Amino acid sequence: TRDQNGTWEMESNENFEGYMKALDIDFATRKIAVRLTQTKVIDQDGDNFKTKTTSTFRNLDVDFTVGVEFDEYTKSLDNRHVKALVTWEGDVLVCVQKGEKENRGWKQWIEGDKLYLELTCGDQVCRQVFKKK
């Protein structure tokens, strides 16, 4: 069939490394791209094609119980070991990540239809906002 319409989820990707190297893509980018999975959306009308591609990586799950300190290896970021403790301050979920970095942690809370997450390390604050789907 010539009908390639649909939403297509990558199951297999062989020698993406060699292909990217042949295209002179830098080592650091190749290290990251080989870990990604793609979803390809094809909208086809006769010989007219529109394709949309998204690349995704799944991070390690983070599971915890409030009030119970746990070991965290921060593989999605700097790959360090921290001892994390999550507590409630009112309706704000507060985490302290004890380790090499000073003032490392995060705070997470709900307002309206949105989730707020503030990440801290040293004097740096990152603010993320998520909408409920």
Add this chain to the structure above:
Amino acid sequence: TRDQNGTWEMESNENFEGYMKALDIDFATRKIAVRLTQTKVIDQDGDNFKTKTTSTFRNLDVDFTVGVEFDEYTKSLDNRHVKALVTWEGDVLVCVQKGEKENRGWKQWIEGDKLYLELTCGDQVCRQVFKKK
């Protein structure tokens, strides 16, 4: 509310760069990570949390008509200009990407519930397989 259950899609991410730099994450990784959007799935039962996070990047759309040569800037890969021509060979969609690289192109076809995509550059072949969702 302390109930943070749900699927949460990132709408905003401020100073992720400064945070990552504070964590000593390498330049090349930071260049990539600032472009990503996250989906956070929270499964919460009392003070028991399970969180799953996925990071995604959306690539540029690729639109074309079979038989009509078009200009392609390969932003998702090596950022080169090629003149791409897609033709049918039977039910196989064949693209030649004319430019600096020799033997650059791809072939795409359906078999059963799967889409096959073979990418070539020089002597390198990458084979991807997708399942229909």
